[PDB]
Design a protein around this ligand. Sequence first.
Ligand SMILES: *[C@@H]1O[C@H](CO)[C@@H](O[C@@H]2O[C@H](CO)[C@@H](O[C@@H]3O[C@H](CO)[C@@H](O)[C@H](O[C@@H]4O[C@H](CO)[C@@H](O)[C@H](O)[C@@H]4O)[C@@H]3O)[C@H](O)[C@H]2NC(C)=O)[C@H](O)[C@H]1NC(C)=O
Ligand SMILES: *[C@@H]1O[C@H](CO)[C@@H](O[C@@H]2O[C@H](CO)[C@@H](O[C@H]3O[C@H](CO)[C@@H](O)[C@H](O)[C@@H]3O)[C@H](O)[C@H]2NC(C)=O)[C@H](O)[C@H]1NC(C)=O
Ligand SMILES: *[C@@H]1O[C@H](CO)[C@@H](O[C@@H]2O[C@H](CO)[C@@H](O)[C@H](O)[C@H]2NC(C)=O)[C@H](O)[C@H]1NC(C)=O
Ligand SMILES: *[C@@H]1O[C@H](CO)[C@@H](O[C@@H]2O[C@H](CO)[C@@H](O)[C@H](O)[C@H]2NC(C)=O)[C@H](O)[C@H]1NC(C)=O
Ligand code: RET
Ligand code: RET
Ligand code: HTG
Ligand code: HTG
Ligand code: HTG
Ligand code: HTG
Ligand code: HG
Ligand code: HG
Ligand code: HG
Ligand code: HG
Ligand code: HG
Ligand code: HG
Ligand code: ZN
Ligand code: ZN
Ligand code: ZN
Ligand code: ZN
Ligand code: ZN
Ligand code: ZN
Ligand code: ZN
Lengths: 348, 348
Amino acid sequence: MNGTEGPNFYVPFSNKTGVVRSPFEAPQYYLAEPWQFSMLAAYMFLLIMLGFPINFLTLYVTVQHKKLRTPLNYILLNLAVADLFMVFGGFTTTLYTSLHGYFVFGPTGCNLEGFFATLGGEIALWSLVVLAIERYVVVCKPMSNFRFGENHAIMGVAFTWVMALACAAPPLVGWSRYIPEGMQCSCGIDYYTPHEETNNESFVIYMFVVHFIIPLIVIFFCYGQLVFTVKEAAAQQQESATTQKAEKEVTRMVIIMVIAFLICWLPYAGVAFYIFTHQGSDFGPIFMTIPAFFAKTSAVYNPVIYIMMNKQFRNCMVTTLCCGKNPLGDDEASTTVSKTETSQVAPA
Amino acid sequence: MNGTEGPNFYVPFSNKTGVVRSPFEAPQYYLAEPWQFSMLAAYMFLLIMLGFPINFLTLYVTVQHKKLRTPLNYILLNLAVADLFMVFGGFTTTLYTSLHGYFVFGPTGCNLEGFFATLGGEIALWSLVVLAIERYVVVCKPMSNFRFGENHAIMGVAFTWVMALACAAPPLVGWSRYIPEGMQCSCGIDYYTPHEETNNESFVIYMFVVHFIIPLIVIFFCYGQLVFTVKEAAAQQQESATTQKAEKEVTRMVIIMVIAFLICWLPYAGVAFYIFTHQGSDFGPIFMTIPAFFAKTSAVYNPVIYIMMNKQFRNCMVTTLCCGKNPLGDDEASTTVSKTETSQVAPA
Ligand SMILES: *[C@@H]1O[C@H](CO)[C@@H](O[C@@H]2O[C@H](CO)[C@@H](O[C@@H]3O[C@H](CO)[C@@H](O)[C@H](O[C@@H]4O[C@H](CO)[C@@H](O)[C@H](O)[C@@H]4O)[C@@H]3O)[C@H](O)[C@H]2NC(C)=O)[C@H](O)[C@H]1NC(C)=O
Ligand SMILES: *[C@@H]1O[C@H](CO)[C@@H](O[C@@H]2O[C@H](CO)[C@@H](O[C@H]3O[C@H](CO)[C@@H](O)[C@H](O)[C@@H]3O)[C@H](O)[C@H]2NC(C)=O)[C@H](O)[C@H]1NC(C)=O
Ligand SMILES: *[C@@H]1O[C@H](CO)[C@@H](O[C@@H]2O[C@H](CO)[C@@H](O)[C@H](O)[C@H]2NC(C)=O)[C@H](O)[C@H]1NC(C)=O
Ligand SMILES: *[C@@H]1O[C@H](CO)[C@@H](O[C@@H]2O[C@H](CO)[C@@H](O)[C@H](O)[C@H]2NC(C)=O)[C@H](O)[C@H]1NC(C)=O
Ligand SMILES: *C/C=C(C)/C=C/C=C(C)/C=C/C1=C(C)CCCC1(C)C
Ligand SMILES: *C/C=C(C)/C=C/C=C(C)/C=C/C1=C(C)CCCC1(C)C
Ligand SMILES: CCCCCCCS[C@@H]1O[C@H](CO)[C@@H](O)[C@H](O)[C@H]1O
Ligand SMILES: CCCCCCCS[C@@H]1O[C@H](CO)[C@@H](O)[C@H](O)[C@H]1O
Ligand SMILES: CCCCCCCS[C@@H]1O[C@H](CO)[C@@H](O)[C@H](O)[C@H]1O
Ligand SMILES: CCCCCCCS[C@@H]1O[C@H](CO)[C@@H](O)[C@H](O)[C@H]1O
Ligand SMILES: [Hg+2]
Ligand SMILES: [Hg+2]
Ligand SMILES: [Hg+2]
Ligand SMILES: [Hg+2]
Ligand SMILES: [Hg+2]
Ligand SMILES: [Hg+2]
Ligand SMILES: [Zn+2]
Ligand SMILES: [Zn+2]
Ligand SMILES: [Zn+2]
Ligand SMILES: [Zn+2]
Ligand SMILES: [Zn+2]
Ligand SMILES: [Zn+2]
Ligand SMILES: [Zn+2]
């Protein structure tokens, strides 16, 4: 047998030499060099020491600042809140495991690492649709006087906070199970085994379409509608109104965010799709570790985006960090506001 | 001429098109694309966001835990400080410099953006010698009844602070000078021009020898000593005493800590050396930017190593972070330390 299936796991290592042991009961150093595990352990650390201050940062700002209440603004708060969970929710454990060399918390732990990770990523994928929608509703405006209010925004927050939930939820209650991958440090869905007990079989097809293929379309498609309308080409202050040229930046951002997704996941979705269609092939632990751990940057490449492609936010952020005011720079140029300082509304 | 020497600088760009401007008076966007500076800018931000908590933490931790008082718990405590100094020291500036495309604070900026760096950079180097020796004195144990006291650790500290100071402070008072390098976002010593009025020539030698090659001897050699004695080959509980065992851990580390140095500084020291031995050839802004900005990771790659190759420190940290205690993990299986908990004195 190429790998070693346990009733709880599947080590991508042959037990010909009888050296394989449950990733729930002992270090997996026989899978790779111990310094290699120290490697994963640091990586995560950085992630935790980074993705934390930054995402927290975000929350605390949006909260404080009163004008930051646009769709985009509502989506990116979520993301920050989802990511705050991955980190404290599961990234922390992955570190634990890494620092030990195996899931010491056994299955409860893998159910953490797995759950959160899955959810947070699904949410990120879904949020990328609640967006395509809006982007379409503002660029191709199929309406007359319909505006995407904060109310429609909180809807998505629920929509996504649920759709992505009915994804990382089942493997915790009979439908599918979470199982360690690569060097047994990370946890994911079970692609490796058929395990009729939980029909890992059905659950995987359910997600390769209803939680991937579909959202992929929905987004790519909407990206087609705004092909003739707003494009990448966006001139200086205004293009048919600075309001029309300011929306083309919320759009030149969203695109990128999506890229940052199909780079953070396809490399993995591909690996996971190859292992499913070949549940037994001769693949090694390094095979799924790299594409998997790489996808964990997911918890950080979003605020960076938004903090570089959102004059509004970025300015409003430095205002928060410079304690008092000192907007310096060249302000948002357009709207600005905060908790009280420049929070003054000037709408209609 | 291949570059544009100014009375205060040296832009690695030809002024044949008369487009070159003082990096103390105008943006250097003609040297590279404006988004690249944005990169440096973005990057600089990630460094500060990570390096602060990580270094601040380490500080408050070494202080609260009354037993973390080994020479190592001194050299790194002093090492984390030297980094906080770089971070707020010149890291802040340099970001501000990348943000506005040029050294707005003129030379003043260049001097801090360049001092502190040279400062801490050296301390981390010297801090490695003050570690190599100590490692020698315990592994090849030169005395028959010697042991470094807290006083000695403070001597090293005072020492590395003198040695490093003895080379970062001179360029502030007439011997050589800090001049911006690469894209003109960072400052360093002058290898570029001979400037007789300041003696760049002489200094640069005094640095490549009395502060690099020689310390690079006092260390590698010392290692060739702990080759026959304590070796990277570290087993489990006890080696000839669980004491001798854990002695091996503090070494596998120092070694790594020395790797994480030659990695972070040779690529730069190399570039720096080539230029010197070619004060006038043709090289571009990117040339020294890369080695240079990568070297700045020196402000973090230490605590991460420490907090990973030190079960006791890691645990004291988990103990601290988990507000109360409950060091979960695996503890150190050996000694522990803190303030009111189990910082209980347990000698002989
Ligand atoms: C790969 O191939 C190996 C060689 O064929 C095979 O080896 C067997 O490994 C199992 C454990 O994985 C060994 O059984 C253990 O024996 C010890 C006695 O030294 C027991 O303590 C242990 O159970 C304990 O139960 C306690 C109560 O629950 C608990 O407190 C303890 O912590 C512990 O769980 C097991 O009984 C067995 O002797 C090995 N046999 C041989 C031939 O060496 C590997 O299992 C196999 N690995 C795979 C398939 O993943
Ligand atoms: C590269 O070649 C450029 C053209 O030779 C040259 O431009 C010159 O720059 C100086 C700036 O110091 C200008 O001088 C001005 O100085 C002050 C301004 O505050 C005033 O006395 C005057 O306005 C004065 O013009 C020169 O006018 C300008 N000459 C030009 C454009 O022809 C750059 O300085 C060169 N880059 C270098 C060597 O750093
Ligand atoms: C163990 O792994 C090997 C390598 O992946 C598997 O061998 C492949 O089997 C398929 C179908 O039988 C062939 O089409 C491939 O050509 C084989 N690969 C090669 C070239 O070696 C093998 O089937 C696996 N055995 C188990 C445990 O199922
Ligand atoms: C400008 O740079 C070029 C290339 O970096 C220099 O040309 C080199 O000159 C040295 C002698 O100083 C020769 O050994 C090399 O073979 C030359 N290479 C090339 C590409 O010609 C040139 O000297 C520099 N000009 C100055 C002096 O500023
Ligand atoms: C370290 C974290 C890991 C390996 C996280 C695992 C996350 C999942 C199993 C997520 C799954 C999917 C998506 C995010 C997009 C849609 C398709 C899935 C089901 C492969
Ligand atoms: C962004 C930070 C920078 C450019 C830091 C600059 C640091 C130096 C100029 C350091 C120089 C050297 C050492 C630390 C060791 C000894 C040899 C030198 C002179 C190349
Ligand atoms: C971030 C620096 C850590 C990554 C470099 C690996 C260095 S090495 C690694 O260190 C572990 C802890 O001491 C040991 O248990 C293990 O045997 C050893 O190979
Ligand atoms: C976008 C990245 C998608 C990656 C999917 C390509 C899987 S490629 C697959 O890997 C196996 C295990 O190493 C090999 O044994 C096999 O020969 C190779 O073709
Ligand atoms: C201290 C927070 C670091 C985040 C970096 C934000 C850079 S912000 C940038 O600054 C330029 C000049 O100062 C302005 O002209 C521009 O409008 C502003 O958006
Ligand atoms: C790892 C230490 C790095 C050693 C530094 C190597 C400097 S090498 C130098 O780089 C110039 C770039 O403009 C080239 O034009 C030139 O031909 C090349 O020899
Ligand atoms: Hg779209
Ligand atoms: Hg990514
Ligand atoms: Hg604001
Ligand atoms: Hg040594
Ligand atoms: Hg480094
Ligand atoms: Hg401790
Ligand atoms: Zn079962
Ligand atoms: Zn989902
Ligand atoms: Zn199947
Ligand atoms: Zn002069
Ligand atoms: Zn020095
Ligand atoms: Zn010279
Ligand atoms: Zn532990």
